Amino acid sequence: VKPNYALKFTLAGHTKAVSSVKFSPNGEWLASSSADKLIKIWGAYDGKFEKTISGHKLGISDVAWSSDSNLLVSASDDKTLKIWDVSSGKCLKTLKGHSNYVFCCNFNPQSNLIVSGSFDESVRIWDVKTGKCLKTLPAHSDPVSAVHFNRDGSLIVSSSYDGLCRIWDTASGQCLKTLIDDDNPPVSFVKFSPNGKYILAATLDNTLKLWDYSKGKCLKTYTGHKNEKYCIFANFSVTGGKWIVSGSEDNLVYIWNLQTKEIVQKLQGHTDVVISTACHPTENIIASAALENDKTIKLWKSDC
Ligand SMILES: O=S(=O)(c1cc(Cl)ccc1Cl)n1cnc2ccccc21
Q1: How many angstroms separate the CA atoms of 288 and 271, rounded?
Q2: By alpha-carbon position, which residue is closest to atom 19 of ligand 1?
Q3: In whole angstroms, what is the distance from residue 191 CA to residue 198 CA?
Q4: Which residues pair with 157 in a beta bridge?
Q5: Which of 24, 47, 256, 274 has the fewest C-beta atoms under 10 angstroms from its C-beta?
Q6: Gap between the Cα atoms of 264 and 194, Å rounded
């Protein structure tokens, strides 16, 4: 009925705000990115620092794993993305083509493509093997805050400070849907649900919304947290009870019951905005990360 997340480890090492945290699909690792221009790798179960991956010339806003846990992609203010071999630390490719800061990135399920979004208002699709830009979508009229592929890679969802979420056909680049509710606040995050039927979207009016994108209908809203300024990730927690997890500008992690929408737990400990959360793929473990006055990542574990 309610989880019991408790703090287990605090991970120190980044020298500026953390920007994103992600667990590897195989459960072994946590990757973090930061405004300090670095990616760090940590053990997912013990929080033990593994190594630093460097090469970007300016801060990093996002990092994402390939589905086989072998590669990372990062998005930077240096206007590039980089594809990294995690085991060796090597930069395999630098993806150049955005005309402004790159803010968000993800691999497709087959990890043969990368999608990126930028302050240049575009969504781009890149070939992983060659590192070349395949398609540029004139997607939005303001910076693109998130991009994510659906379960089979046939669709991309993007979100933007223009107030819209858009769904794109990967193969053709056509805009298939635009989603917006009754107000127009910036959309700061979007992702498809694990089963691919829904989209979870955050807006800078203190609201998370679950959409049936096929029907174009908002089915659930999650409120009670504070999110008026920063692009804060949100997650589906799948391993125990069915929860929604998000950071907050009041320095807490919020956890809601997906079905009932009630808050079930708040996690206290960070000393600045919780900008990013991630949920472990097999264990009831949450990672949270905070902005410049805190600079740490925390690992929390629950029995359900
Ligand atoms: O499949 S889901 O995306 C999902 C969400 C979470 Cl938190 C954990 C696991 C899964 Cl599988 N999903 C979307 N709506 C749902 C309603 C009931 C059960 C699952 C639902």
Answers
A1: 12
A2: 242
A3: 8
A4: 148, 167
A5: 47
A6: 21
Let me know: does 194 contact 152? Beta carbons within 8 Å.
no
Q: How far apart are the CA of 242 and the centre of ligand 1, in A?
A: 7
Q: How far is the CA of 195 from the centre of ligand 1 (A)?
A: 7
What are 262's two structure tokens? 């009630």
The overall longest dimension of the chain from CA atoms, in Å, is 48
Pick the closest to residue 64 from 38, 32, 18 (CA basis). Answer: 32
Closest-lying ligand 1 atom to the alpha carbon of residue 236: 7
What the block records as the tokens of 42 is 């940590």
CB-ligand 1 contact for 193 (6 Å cutoff):
yes
Find where tokens 């993007």 sit.
158
172 phi, psi to nearest 5 deg: -100, -20
- The Cα–Cα gap between 251 and 226 comes to 9
Sequence length of the chain is 304
Probe target for ligand 1 pocket from 238, 243, 282, with the most ligand atoms within 8 Å of CB: 238
CA-closest candidate to residue 126, choices 159, 86, 95: 95
254 in contact with ligand 1, CB cutoff 6 A: no
Q: Which atom of ligand 1 is nearest to the CA of 237?
A: 7
> Ligand 1 pocket, 200 CB below 6 A?
no
Contact 140, 164 (CB under 8 A): yes
| Degrees to nearest 5, angle at CA 261 with 259 and 264 | 105
Gap between the Cα atoms of 3 and 1, Å rounded: 7
CA of residue 280 to ligand 1 center, whole Å: 15
Query: DSSP states of 240-293 as a string?
Result: SS-EEEE--TTS-EEEEETTT--EEEEE---SS-EEEEEE-SSSSEEEEEE-TT
